[PDB]
Structure 1
Amino acid sequence: RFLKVKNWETDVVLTDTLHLKSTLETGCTEHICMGSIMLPSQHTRVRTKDQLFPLAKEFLDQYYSSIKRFGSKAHMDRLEEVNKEIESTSTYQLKDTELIYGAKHAWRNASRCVGRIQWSKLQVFDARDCTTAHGMFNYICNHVKYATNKGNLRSAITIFPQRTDGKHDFRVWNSQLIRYAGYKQPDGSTLGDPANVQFTEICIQQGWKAPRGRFDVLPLLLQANGNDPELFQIPPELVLEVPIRHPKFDWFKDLGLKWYGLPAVSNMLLEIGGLEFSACPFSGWYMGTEIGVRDYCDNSRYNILEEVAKKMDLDMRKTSSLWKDQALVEINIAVLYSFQSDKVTIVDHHSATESFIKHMENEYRCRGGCPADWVWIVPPMSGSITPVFHQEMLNYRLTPSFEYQPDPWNTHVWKG
């Protein structure tokens, strides 16, 4: 069965056959679309030898196809080797080549990621020999240095040991490797990043001396082999930050804003051939709107629209003045200007969405499809003047994949 998507701006129609290789479920049915649910049951992640070899076999079939060795003696022997290692040891180990392939294809298959044109240029750091939280700190430091590269950002992922019985998990408790603390005040107001208040409290309880400023980089909280997590401060010279100024508004610097340069997601689960890598930090570079729209202007985040509009002296009485929309653009101009001025890699939403359209068309041509989540691909400002708004998209889940997992502090069994 073939399926067609149409771009209603260009009338370009593409044909998807790749959705036929889809295994996992969407969450939708014939009678309800769950397309806007943030965490469906299926996108989140306890696994026995029963279902593991079919998952291994499918991944290895995919791997050896991609290297033009399907049905080779190398292919058949590896299947035999994995089979015996599973029945003997109940799991198996990926080769280095398989791990790299798997991690790149997990990114390639991330239907909510607009930055996937870059998927083949991913630096994979094998941290599967790591055993302790200190060892994890060292691997993460090296990732942060390599990926930052003095502002010339490089995509990277660091992969810690896979889950075994679910009782010895490696976890990075931070949602992102670099994030600002958030503090709830007795008067109800929040200082810093409201998104991080719960995590900041865990860190403080674990013994972190909080500076209690508005832009305090949080410490790393690292769990190795299912032991209690441990606190580590990222070396400040490794944390690249950009002061935010506006190219025309000199008062903008006086808002005291900055942001870190490296977006590095650290709380997701990487699934490859039925193996679960529960600690797999990955990083790229920012699209401007992630900082300027969501981080600064979400009502539940830094929420600076009011103060920015106040200093612009906009008509703030009625919303029909679009003072909210006016300030949002300026703030997003400032983020982009500050990053480019400091020669820190960033991409605006116009460039990033045009690239993704080209990526997607290329993927239909060479791969038969490109799974894409329109709800997430369309940027959070100026939607319809980007070409993805007009792009029909098919969403389905391929493996290897990145999945959500529950926050560790809700599942962890504390040792003491």
Structure 2
Amino acid sequence: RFLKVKNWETDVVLTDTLHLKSTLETGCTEHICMGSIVLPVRTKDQLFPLAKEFLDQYYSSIKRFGSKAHMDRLEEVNKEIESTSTYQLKDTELIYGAKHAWRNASRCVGRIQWSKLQVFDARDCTTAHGMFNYICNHVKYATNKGNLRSAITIFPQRTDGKHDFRVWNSQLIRYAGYKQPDGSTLGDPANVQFTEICIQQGWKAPRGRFDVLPLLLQANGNDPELFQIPPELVLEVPIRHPKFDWFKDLGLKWYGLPAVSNMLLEIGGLEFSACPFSGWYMGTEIGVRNYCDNSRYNILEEVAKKMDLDMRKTSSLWKDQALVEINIAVLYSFQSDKVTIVDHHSATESFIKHMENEYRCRGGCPADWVWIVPPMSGSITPVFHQEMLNYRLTPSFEYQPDPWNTHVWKG
């Protein structure tokens, strides 16, 4: 079967066949679309088909499909599964797998970059201290003094589900949040619960507006342990505005390295529950969401106050005006300090070129419009006008529950 998508600005029509290789569920049915819902131990029986489907894809990609090496590898994996109930990936397969999980991540606008991913194999790690060392090395490598390089660090896979490796942090670098007795929040309101856990675990909180959180690291299903990332490895950018000299006195800064650490990587039926990965920011992630969401730093009013905008009526568009200036500030600040960042025009234009290339060479590119369209200036980016098809391919990155909800405390 063939499915078409249309760009309503260019009238370019593309044809998707790749969707035929999807087997996992979307959440939608013929009677309901759940496109805007944020969240819509394996047996031997389920495992070998998943391994075989993956190894078939891997051997096809290297133009060795049906070879003796391919057949030998299927046999080797089959035997390993029946003998040990699981199997181990070759390094080549792991690298291919991680790259493909990124290529398949339908909510990621940055995928033009997917084939350039440094994979750090941390499957020989056994302790939380060992995890800390791997993560420091990842941060230093990825940061590269501001010339950011995409990377992923992959810790041992799930075995019985009782021995999981997990990074409890949702990203490697994030700022603490503290709920005050008066109901206000100091720092980042997104991280209040996790900050409370860190403190309970023994972290000495500085209690400021941009305190970098400690890592809370779980190895082999043991209770997690706290570590402080060496501050010299945490690159940060003070935020200033090219025309407005009062902007610096808002005292804003952000970290350069966006590093998602709470997702589960599935490759060939194996589950990598600790697989922190990093790229670089698109400016709106910081300037629109982190700064201006009502439930985050929430700086819109204070900025618009300083700009002396007419704030008596929403129809003056004061919030929109202040929004643009904050985002100019973020891009200017990162660029001035030579820390990699991409604006939403550049990133979306590149994504459309990537998507068209994927259609032509791969037969499709699953994309979640709800997440791909930037959270400001939607229709002046080309992705707003692009029809997309959202479906699930493996290898993949998946959401998993926060570990404090499921962890069996040993004591």
TM superposition score category, shorter chain reference: over 0.9
Q: Shift of the alpha carbon at 1:364?
A: 0.2
Q: Shift of the alpha carbon at 1:47?
A: 1.1
Question: Hey, what's the Cα distance between the residues in 2 that align with 1:395 and 1:188?
Answer: 40
Q: Secondary structure at the match of 1:98?
A: helix
Question: Hey, what's the Cα distance between the residues in 2 that align with 1:181 and 1:380?
Answer: 24
Residue correspondences, number: 411
Q: Secondary structure at the match of 1:196?
A: helix
Cα deviation digits, residues 13-71 of structure 1 (max 9, x gap) = 0000000000101110000000000011xxxxx31111000000000000000000000
Q: Shift of the alpha carbon at 1:406?
A: 0.2
Question: Hey, what's the Cα distance between the residues in 2 that align with 1:25 and 1:63?
Answer: 23
Q: Which residue of 1 aligns with 2:156?
A: 161
1:17-416 aligned at under 5 Å gives the runs 17-40=17-40, 46-416=41-411
Question: Hey, what's the Cα distance between the residues in 2 that align with 1:324 and 1:338?
Answer: 21
Percent sequence identity over aligned pairs: 100
Cα deviation digits, residues 270-315 of structure 1 (max 9, x gap) = 0000000000000000000000000000000000001000000000
Q: Shift of the alpha carbon at 1:248?
A: 0.3
Question: Hey, what's the Cα distance between the residues in 2 that align with 1:159 and 1:246?
Answer: 38
Cα deviation digits, residues 324-376 of structure 1 (max 9, x gap) = 00000000000000000000000000000000000000000000000000000
Cα deviation digits, residues 195-224 of structure 1 (max 9, x gap) = 000000000000000000000000000000
Give runs of ≥4 in structure 1 deviating > 2 Å. none
Cα deviation digits, residues 101-134 of structure 1 (max 9, x gap) = 0000000000000000000000000000000000
Q: Shift of the alpha carbon at 1:237?
A: 0.3
Q: Shift of the alpha carbon at 1:226?
A: 0.2
Q: Shift of the alpha carbon at 1:74?
A: 0.1
Question: Hey, what's the Cα distance between the residues in 2 that align with 1:74 and 1:50?
Answer: 24
Q: Secondary structure at the match of 2:246?
A: helix
Q: Secondary structure at the match of 2:385?
A: coil
**Any stretches of 5+ residues in structure 1 without a counterpart?**
41-45
Question: Hey, what's the Cα distance between the residues in 2 that align with 1:130 and 1:22?
Answer: 33
Q: Secondary structure at the match of 2:382?
A: coil
TM-score (norm 2): 1.00
TM-score (norm 1): 0.99
Question: Hey, what's the Cα distance between the residues in 1 that align with 2:53 and 2:9?
Answer: 38
Cα deviation digits, residues 168-196 of structure 1 (max 9, x gap) = 00000000000000000000000000000
Question: Hey, what's the Cα distance between the residues in 2 that align with 1:254 and 1:48?
Answer: 58
Question: Hey, what's the Cα distance between the residues in 1 that align with 2:289 and 2:16?
Answer: 32
Q: Secondary structure at the match of 2:303?
A: helix
Question: Hey, what's the Cα distance between the residues in 2 that align with 1:92 and 1:128?
Answer: 13
Question: Hey, what's the Cα distance between the residues in 2 that align with 1:23 and 1:117?
Answer: 24
Cα deviation digits, residues 125-177 of structure 1 (max 9, x gap) = 00000000000000000000000000000000000000000000000000000
Question: Hey, what's the Cα distance between the residues in 2 that align with 1:16 and 1:356?
Answer: 17
Question: Hey, what's the Cα distance between the residues in 2 that align with 1:24 and 1:139?
Answer: 32
- C-alpha RMSD of the superposition: 0.3
Question: Hey, what's the Cα distance between the residues in 2 that align with 1:247 and 1:199?
Answer: 35
